[PDB]
Design a protein around this ligand. Structure first.
Ligand SMILES: OC[C@H]1O[C@H](OC[C@H]2O[C@H](OC[C@H]3O[C@H](OC[C@H]4O[C@H](O)[C@H](O)[C@@H](O)[C@@H]4O)[C@H](O)[C@@H](O)[C@@H]3O)[C@H](O)[C@@H](O)[C@@H]2O)[C@H](O)[C@@H](O)[C@@H]1O
Ligand SMILES: [Ca+2]
Ligand SMILES: [Pr+3]
Ligand SMILES: [Pr+3]
Ligand SMILES: [Pr+3]
Length: 1265
């Protein structure tokens, strides 16, 4: 029996492929994988490809490609018999040889020769048993074509031996009949097999065939002195006879006096900056009260606009149907074809029911809902699928680039139609990432390091413009508010000064103007004199979220080191070499490469390395992506891509995924299908490393979901043992190594000593840790020995373990006395430890793959602390921080996860995280924490536009009011954020501040500074928009070029932004210490910061752009004839006046034939001037400056420039402007006209049937033959 293997990937060794087991081991012999049987060689473990092996007796062939077992025919004599994939002979069925020959065998097992007439699909087989595909074969002069993929007879035209000969399925030449090629080309022949070109009459219907014989669609031109237009049918339509309904329909009714608007100004209409939308309501002069008596309307008698007016018949019809479905309208179906007068009468029948329902309910809220759902309603199509009923008012119409986290984006631009949503000149500078701050990319990177930039301006939601000086100021104000949160929010309290934040984490560095880094750096020199010395600097440790490789070096040269850069090379190497499964895993020798940021192979100096903070996981990185992977595997239907699974927001899915994620964390390393292996081995390297500030993720001590701090991970004992050990032993110089067996040994020599040869100080002897790490579950040393080279400072010294590994797990020893006598071992005269195979071997537990050990020196006191005090001396150079003993004494703790359960409305006091933080304050001080990175404390949105904004998470990165950190409601209801109230928060900070570290100063508390975006904003505003991707590159959709959009982009002006916005700028300017900050010329703007305007209400002029909101392109209402937007707040001529019916004026709609020409009036009653106009969802027409339709004549040909934009259109004598269509001169030349109706030049245009034509710069088609 070939065993089935399931988990494990393929590898390439020596130019052949091998398969690695879940255990880690190469597989040998005949084995099933992927449901297809493959063989693997006895010694080299090599996969067999295109050879013969014997799996349990029977002779089996394996594919040249993929390695899978397959069919084969061997001809010893006569006809080869042929064999199934699993051995055995074929009694009656197809097999395909490796050469690609396909034979069919009879019941007797001989190869079938000649014709093979199956169950309704005749086939052929030539002599020698091969099937024929893709050629014509005369069985007996039939000349029957056989398909390339299947040997089935097909109708096809064969250009051999003459031209245009057509043959059918049974193989008769199709004289006087229609024939069809493989590409779908349609020929027509005459009696005696010769094809036809030009205009033909087939069944009282005209068709056009070009010069190579193809019957054609969407082709216009004069033929035998008759202008014909052959449509999608291929059928000729008269281009003289009009294609529109002649005659006008009055929109004046008995009811229009009463439904006319009370007034024609802002008073009577609900509006967005004057513009009207689909959800607009208005006050008619009269109300049909209880559907029985016309009364004068009161101040509160507003009704939906859509009740009495619509932008066209198509929406009118659909409205009537939808309300009829809600049981209000009449029981009968209407269409855009249906007559105008009938729709208007039907609408008045609906109104009667609407008002009767309002009288009954004593409310109009039910109506508001049913109008909102009508706008977003869906419908059956001719295909049978769900489309949108009103595409113009949905996401459907906002098509562009997909490259953005929320599937689209806009950029705000200026435009004279919306004067108040226009930004100043030289603002809205996008993509000023650290790399592109000057406006051009600059590689600051040196020789073996990368200098790329993965930044982009539009990340999420509504994107704030941080190239505006007024905004840059409000960002400074917000920092000041946070650094003085306590004193500001609770002035009555005497201890308010203890409830203040100390440092910040700058979020989305690659998505905002990099000027904000220098602004922030200036603040802390002014306020807290961080520049003076290490002591001051290290009391405020800030961090960057700077993912791009180049940002490390930008930070160093441009930004001083005003914030700490992340180490990405370490995180990546720690993930690659330890966390991955055995199949994907990098070697430990990689830790000694050159492309690492900090070389630790012989780190022996201070103030040389780049100041940095390194980590393994974080609330976003390597957390959410793993959950998504599980969602994808469990629900392929809904989410097939790992990227697609990130977009999911349903809690049931996550709940399901987490129970797996939690259950998988418990499993042994070899069967960890989703989670990270070797977590304690990774943290063992991280927390012992020199020249770095380690950051520990909440979710590695505790479970990423559920109650805060409630459930521990498998790794808690190991990691908390390391953290306290860091406090007592880790100091001095470092050196990594990796022996021939691939076993890492990290050594710290202890305070005073910087190398192995250093004799050190008094402090040295009892300090300095030693770490051993292998990532090989099948490690077997045998004769070879592993060596920990401690210093000569540690010669002839007794050492005891801190961590060791068993099959059961990892043993942590807290004190020397907990250690058994046998484990103790003493160093030799050189300061070396030696390890046997009887000691160090391969393991596979839950907590380790390979082996982990950590050894410390025996006889440390309890007062012993390895950490070093910050220097007070002046520092030279430009770095704010300096990577040395004192900085490495610091340690950050990211004390939150996204997926912490959200305490319910009536949750008890101590379910909220900030209460729990206070209770466990001393726990953090015993782990060596000097900075506590709190979550963003801002009130989260719940609209679900992104993971961070769904109600089950509310992590706080998705916020509307960024001065609101959990304040009470207006009535005095406690109203906490996911983590607790402003009071609960202020305590938590005091609690952390009460804790005192090794140097007697408090634990720092870090605010999460999020300058990039704002979510879910209350008030609409009109803006000009262009459809783009995340970089702000124009996706160049014609309909979305500087059009007007009703964006939710304006704050309420009664929120905490209005209270505290820019409040402290005046005050700061007056301070001398801040003079440097305000005088600085910022790199990107080249202008100074501007603190003279306060931002109390956010508005569209302070934003670069926004993610797509799915209001729709035509959500802002607009008369099609005039092609102007409706505006109530202005009496300007660039806006259209209200539809004539709504101001009780005479109004008519329709086409009107006139002696001079043809005029068209919209549903609103206005005349079409200088506009394209679609009719009855079919034909387009253009109307000139004089309000007359443009039509071609005999004197003036069909090819015309109409708009004076140098753009040429093809217009028939109907006035019909043909689109996606070919057109002809009277001379003979052919032109093609694209989706938009305009002529094509210098371009190949493809054809539905795979024909291709080339059109010159001229516009004319290149003729063929
Ligand atoms: O370049 C470094 C990479 O090396 C490894 O590549 C693994 C491959 O994984 C998948 O395919 C698995 C496939 O591998 C062999 O066949 C390879 C291909 O051979 C043909 O040319 C054939 O026509 C192809 O159809 C076939 O894929 C095995 O014989 C076969 O059984 C397996 O199905 C990917 O589709 C490939 O693109 C990869 O090369 C390593 O695993 C990667 O992670 C490395 O990046
Ligand atoms: Ca931005
Ligand atoms: Pr007349
Ligand atoms: Pr349409
Ligand atoms: Pr029609």
């Amino acid at each position: 029996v070939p065993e089935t293997i399931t988990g494990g990937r393929y590898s390439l060794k020596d130019g052949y492929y091998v398969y690695l087991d879940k255990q880690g081991k190469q597989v040998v012999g005949p084995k099933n994988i992927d449901n297809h049987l493959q063989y693997f060689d006895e010694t080299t473990g090599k996969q067999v490809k295109g050879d013969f092996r014997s799996v349990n007796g029977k002779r089996i062939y394996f594919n040249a490609n993929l390695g899978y077992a397959d069919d084969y025919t061997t001809d010893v004599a006569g006809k080869l018999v042929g064999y199934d994939s699993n051995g055995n002979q074929v009694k009656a069925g197809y097999v395909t040889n490796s050469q690609g020959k396909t034979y069919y065998f009879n019941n007797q097992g001989e190869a079938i020769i000649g014709l093979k007439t199956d169950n309704n699909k005749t086939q052929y087989f030539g002599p020698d048993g091969a099937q024929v595909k893709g050629a014509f074969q005369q069985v007996n002069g039939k000349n029957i074509y056989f398909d390339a993929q299947t040997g089935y007879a097909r109708q096809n035209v064969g250009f051999l031996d003459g031209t245009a000969k057509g043959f059918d399925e049974q193989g008769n030449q199709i004289k006087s009949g229609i024939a069809t090629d493989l590409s779908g080309n349609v020929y027509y022949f005459d009696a005696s097999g010769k094809m036809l070109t030009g205009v033909q009459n087939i069944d009282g219907k005209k068709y056009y065939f070009d010069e190579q014989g193809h019957r054609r669609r969407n082709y216009a031109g004069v033929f035998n002195n008759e202008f014909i237009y052959f449509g999608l049918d291929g059928v000729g339509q008269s281009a003289i006879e009009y294609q529109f309904e002649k005659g006008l329909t009055s929109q004046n009714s008995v009811a229009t006096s009463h439904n006319a608007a009370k007034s024609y100004d802002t008073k009577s209409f609900t509006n967005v900056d004057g513009f009207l939308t689909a959800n607009s309501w208005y006050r008619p002069t009269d109300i049909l009260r209880n559907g029985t008596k016309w009364e004068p309307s009161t101040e509160t008698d507003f009704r939906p606009l859509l009740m009495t007016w619509w932008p066209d018949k198509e929406v009118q019809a659909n409205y009537l149907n939808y309300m009829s479905a809600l049981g209000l309208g009449d029981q009968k179906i209407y269409t855009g074809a249906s007559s105008q007068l009938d729709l208007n009468n039907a609408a008045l029948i609906v109104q009667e029911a609407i008002e009767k329902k309002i009288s009954l309910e004593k409310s109009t809220k039910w109506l508001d809902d049913s109008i909102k759902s009508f706008i977003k309603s869906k419908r059956k199509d001719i295909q049978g699928n769900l489309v949108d009923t009103n595409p113009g008012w949905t996401i459907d119409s906002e098509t562009g680039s997909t490259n953005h986290l929320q599937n689209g984006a806009f950029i705000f631009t200026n435009s004279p139609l919306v004067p108040e949503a226009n930004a100043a000149e030289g603002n809205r500078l996008i993509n000023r990432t650290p790399s592109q701050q000057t406006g051009n990319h600059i590689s600051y990177a040196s020789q073996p390091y990368s200098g790329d930039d993965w930044g982009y301006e539009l990340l999420l939601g509504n994107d704030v413009d941080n190239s505006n000086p007024i905004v840059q100021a409000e960002q400074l104000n917000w920092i000041h508010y946070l650094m003085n949160f306590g004193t500001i929010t609770a002035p009555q309290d005497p201890d308010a000064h203890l409830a203040n934040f100390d440092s910040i984490r700058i979020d989305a560095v690659d998505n905002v103007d990099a000027d904000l880094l220098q602004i922030a750096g200036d603040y802390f020199k002014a306020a807290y004199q961080v520049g003076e010395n290490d002591k001051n600097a290290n009391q405020h440790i800030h961090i960057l979220q700077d993912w791009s490789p180049n940002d490390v070096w930008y930070n160093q040269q441009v930004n001083g080191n005003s914030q700490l850069t992340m180490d990405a090379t370490m995180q990546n190497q720690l993930l690659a070499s330890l966390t991955r499964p055995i199949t994907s895993r990098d070697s430990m020798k990689s830790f000694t490469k050159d492309a690492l940021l900090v070389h630790r192979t012989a780190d022996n100096s201070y103030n040389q390395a780049v100041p940095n903070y390194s980590f393994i996981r974080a609330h976003d990185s390597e957390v959410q992506t793993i959950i998504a992977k599980i969602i994808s595997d469990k629900h392929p239907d809904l989410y097939p891509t790992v990227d697609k699974a990130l977009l999911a927001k349903d809690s049931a899915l996550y709940d399901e995924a987490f129970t797996e994620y939690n259950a998988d964390m418990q499993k042994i390393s070899s069967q960890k299908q989703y989670t990270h292996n070797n977590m304690p081995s990774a943290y063992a390297i991280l927390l012992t490393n020199k020249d770095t500030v380690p950051r520990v993720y909440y979710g590695d001590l505790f479970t990423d979901n559920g109650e805060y701090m409630a459930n521990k991970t498998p790794y808690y004992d190991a990691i908390t043992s390391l953290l306290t050990a860091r406090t007592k032993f880790v100091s001095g110089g470092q050196s990594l190594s990796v022996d021939k067996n691939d076993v890492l040994t990290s050594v710290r020599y202890g305070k005073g000593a910087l190398s192995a040869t250093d004799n050190g100080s008094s402090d040295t002897r009892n300090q300095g840790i030693g770490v051993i790490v292998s990532n090989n579950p099948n490690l077997d040393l045998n004769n070879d020995k592993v060596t920990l080279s401690m210093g000569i400072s540690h010669a002839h010294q007794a050492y005891r373990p801190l961590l060791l590994t068993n099959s059961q797990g990892i043993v942590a020893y807290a004190t020397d006395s907990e250690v058994p006598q046998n484990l103790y071992k003493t160093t030799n005269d050189k300061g070396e430890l030696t390890f046997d195979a009887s000691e160090i071997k391969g393991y596979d537990t839950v907590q380790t793959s390979g082996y982990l050990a950590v050894w410390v020196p025996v006889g440390a006191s309890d007062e012993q602390d390895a950490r070093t005090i910050a220097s007070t001396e002046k520092n030279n150079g430009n770095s704010v921080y300096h990577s040395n003993a004192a900085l490495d004494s610091q340690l950050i703790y990211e004390g939150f996860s996204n997926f912490q359960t959200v305490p319910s409305k009536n949750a008890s006091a101590d379910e909220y995280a900030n209460v729990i933080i206070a209770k466990h304050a001393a726990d953090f001080n015993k782990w060596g924490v000097t900075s506590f990175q709190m979550a963003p404390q801002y009130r989260s949105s719940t609209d679900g536009s992104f993971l961070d904004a769904v109600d089950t998470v509310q992590n706080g990165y998705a916020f509307t009011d960024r001065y609101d950190l959990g304040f009470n409601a207006a009535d005095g209801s406690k109203n906490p954020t996911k983590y607790g109230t402003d009071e609960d928060l202020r305590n938590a900070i005091k609690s952390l501040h009460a804790q005192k570290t090794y140097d007697g100063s408090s634990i720092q508390v870090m605010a999460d500074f999020v300058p990039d975006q704002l979510y879910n904003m209350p008030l609409e505003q009109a803006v000009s928009v262009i459809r783009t991707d995340k970089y702000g590159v124009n996706s160049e959709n014609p309909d979305i070029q500087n059009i007007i959009y009703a964006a939710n982009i304006k704050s309420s002006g009664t929120d905490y932004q209005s209270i505290y916005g820019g409040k402290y700028l005046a005050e700061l300017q007056k301070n001398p210490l801040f003079k440097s900050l305000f005088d600085r010329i910022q790199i990107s703007t080249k202008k100074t910061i501007d603190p003279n305007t306060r931002i109390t209400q956010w508005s569209a002029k302070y934003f670069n752009g926004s993610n797509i909101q799915g209001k729709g392109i035509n959500y802002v209402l607009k008369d099609w004839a005039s092609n102007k937007y409706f505006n109530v707040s202005s009496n300007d001529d660039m806006y259209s006046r209200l539809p004539k019916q709504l101001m009780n004026q005479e109004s008519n709609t329709g086409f009107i034939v006139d002696d001079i020409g043809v005029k068209y009036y919209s549903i609103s009653g206005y005349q079409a001037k200088n506009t394209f106009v679609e009719d009855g969802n079919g034909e387009w027409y253009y109307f000139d400056n004089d309000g007359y339709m443009v039509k071609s004549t005999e004197e003036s040909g069909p090819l015309r420039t109409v708009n004076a934009s140098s753009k040429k259109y093809y217009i028939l004598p109907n006035g019909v402007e043909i689109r996606n269509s070919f057109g002809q001169d009277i001379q003979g030349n052919t032109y093609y006209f694209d989706a938009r109706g305009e002529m094509v030049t210098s371009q190949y245009i493809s054809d539905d049937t795979q024909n291709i034509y080339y059109f010159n710069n001229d516009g004319t088609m290149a003729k063929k033959g």
